[model samples]
Target: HMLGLGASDFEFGVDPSADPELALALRVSMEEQRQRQEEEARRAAAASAAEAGIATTGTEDSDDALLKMTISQQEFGRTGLPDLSSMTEEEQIAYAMQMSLQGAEFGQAESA
Candidate 1:
């Protein structure tokens, strides 16, 4: 009976996968695989071909049609002119020219 070993001879060899205490000490996260699948697939495609050479020829198309169409989009509607005193001289002259070009009418001036 005394030939084999003593009780405390290999004390901490008491640790084992058999030890509930030791197994708990070295535990690791198993969720790393689950964490991998967490963030995925945010989002998830062209080229050329060429050939052409043709120069201008007897295409003497005059702007005769364009010439007759001055003020190309002449819509008829009255517009408001700005206050005379509120404008700077530059603004006054520019606004006046616009009104004159438009042939706009306005109220007559008062003597006061």
Candidate 2:
């Protein structure tokens, strides 16, 4: 009945009564699942890149790196701060400076 392929339609095939509500629900569900899957994939890739001490060009196995390094930091007082405790102050500064200089040097051409 929900599928509109009820016993009557099975016998008659009188338009088969398409349910716009059901179709819309299915479409939304499919799109949400797709977005979640994409987000998961992106996070996985970003994690791999971070682990390798490299960056991503928003692509899988990209030869290009991101222009900026996403620092994991905490709040200093109120503003969110990067936990640069892992790196020395000099290194942190150097890293930031290097990111500005690099500017997508390792970026690859995105697929159309």
Candidate 3:
């Protein structure tokens, strides 16, 4: 039963790095999704900041914005990253899990 999740992708759940073509398509789609979410988060931050008066202190929304910048930087290739397309999956995951995560802890958090 647990194997189902791992096999959700290509045959036998090919490793993400195992297929470059599919990876590129996934990157494009994922990139698009991130933009939408990032834009949405911006507006959401503005609204919350005005309402809560914590925009200057850097709360969750603030943290999100800052992390969003990192994601943008990575995507824009601002750092001239070695890899053709470094996965922002790490950046997003870091931000999403960074909150009270202190690093580590994935499925464990889910079981909560």
Candidate 4:
């Protein structure tokens, strides 16, 4: 019954208020509507910033504030740096740069 009478019958609001499945579907629909509204709000904010002729991309006005800040050992702290006590100094700096730029700090490093 989840598939319904036919594929073409997969329309919303056929009987939203009463049916339990329809109620669940209505909740999903409402959540999707909320997401659409939020997306529209973000778009409007971006457009407003652009129309004001502001330096939005590389400024605090941009959606990504981290883009403005330079990547540094102090900025990232322990995570940005590496365990060069085990590795070579060259390897440490190399991997540090890699981790900072590519964010390899989260998951497993390579083919291991």
Candidate 5:
């Protein structure tokens, strides 16, 4: 018995007495399967989030309007991003100017 337990005492699916080496292999195989399943689940979640235009950096959504809209319709009534439609013409222009400046800085860094 690899685990020092008889078949009657062992409750898990793998029988320890089959062969010590076989039991070890079985354990390793089971662990690898579990890890692969977990990795597949993570990848699936990331793909789903990407399809929905949501960030998948495993962190809370922090951006404004786009982040707010990612929530379900039922929860949409609770909270949301600021309404860009409500911004005045001057405010819109200022926001655009700020975003343009930030993007330019980001682009310069990317080029460097």
Candidate 6:
């Protein structure tokens, strides 16, 4: 009698605001928005660093430092030298060169 719209059509009349499914969807949407904002902020910081000409290649810096330390250890013998960590950049380079030269001299003496 009520225009025979059928029960399925009436299902759409349910209040979505009170539905748990709708609530979860809204929560997920909010979380996605927060993530997008965080990503944007990170990008902005990176861009600012680039504009300022600051060194931001974190991976490269760490890799190079590690390589330098390893070479230092190889040239100096494990207990032959002081810890590289306490030295300044210039000091580290100078100490490594001195040790490598000493190693070369020792090697020559042993062979000849």
Give me the candidate number with maximum lDDT.
Answer: 6
In model 3, what lDDT does residue 37 have?
Answer: 100
The total number of steric clashes, by the backbone 3 Å criterion, in model 5 comes to: 0
Model 5, which residues run further than 4 Å from truth? 1-14, 52-112
lDDT of 3 by residue, 78-107 (tens): 543334235475654554565647655543
| Candidate 1: tens digits of C-alpha lDDT, residues 69-91 | 53343322213346778777777
Scored against the true structure, residue 10 in model 1 reaches a CA lDDT of 67
Better of 1 and 6 by TM-score: 6
lDDT of 1 at 111: 28
Candidate achieving higher lDDT, 4 or 5: 4
Query: Which candidate leads the pack in TM-score?
Result: 2
Error of 6 at 51 (Å): 2.5
Candidate 3 has an lDDT of 0.66
Candidate 3, which segments miss by more than 4 Å at Cα? Answer: 1-12, 51-112
TM-score, prediction 3:
0.32
State TM-scores per candidate.
0.19, 0.33, 0.32, 0.29, 0.32, 0.30
Can you write out model 5's per-residue Cα lDDT over 1-83, one digit (the tens) per residue?
Answer: 37575667655555588578878898899999999999999978887878746754545465665555666553755333245
Indicate whether candidate 2 or candidate 3 has the larger TM-score. 2
23-111 in candidate 4: lDDT tens per residue?
88778999999999999998789778787565344445654545535444446665544565777767766775665776555544433
Score each candidate by Cα lDDT.
0.50, 0.59, 0.66, 0.65, 0.64, 0.69
Q: Count the backbone clashes (under 3 Å) in each candidate.
A: 0, 5, 0, 0, 0, 0
- Residue 31 CA displacement from its true place in model 1, Å: 70
